[PDB]
């Protein structure tokens, strides 16, 4: 059985290590996407505020 579980974790471990490489990237690109969406929306709001101040003056 010890041999059994060794075989077990072993395989599951290699597959889940590949899955964790994939998960690390995916987490990177999701966090980067969220941050860059925040940046783009902030720049758009800044441009809108600039269009408002231009209208005011």
């Amino acid at each position: 059985a010890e041999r059994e579980a060794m075989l077990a974790k072993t395989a599951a471990d290699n597959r889940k290590s590949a899955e964790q490489v994939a998960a690390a990237q995916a987490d990177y690109e999701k966090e980067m996407a969220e941050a860059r969406a925040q940046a783009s929306a902030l720049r758009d709001e800044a441009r809108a505020a600039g269009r408002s101040v231009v209208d005011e003056k």
């Binding site: 041999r3 060794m6 075989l7 974790k9 072993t10 395989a11 471990d13 290699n14 290590s17």
Partner: protein
């Protein structure tokens, strides 16, 4: 004594036969079994490293 000598020579002949033709394969099959145990035992360890 004669019976003892004869059966002892027969035992020696069969021992030689098994040592020269039965011992080698059993030995190497076991060798491979253990070698593969080794390989897998390791795998686990390294995959834990990965």
């Amino acid at each position: 004594m004669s019976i003892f000598i004869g059966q002892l020579i027969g035992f020696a002949v069969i021992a030689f036969i098994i040592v020269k033709w039965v011992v080698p394969p059993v030995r190497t099959l076991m060798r491979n079994q253990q070698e593969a145990v080794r390989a897998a035992l390791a795998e686990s360890a390294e995959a834990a490293k990965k």
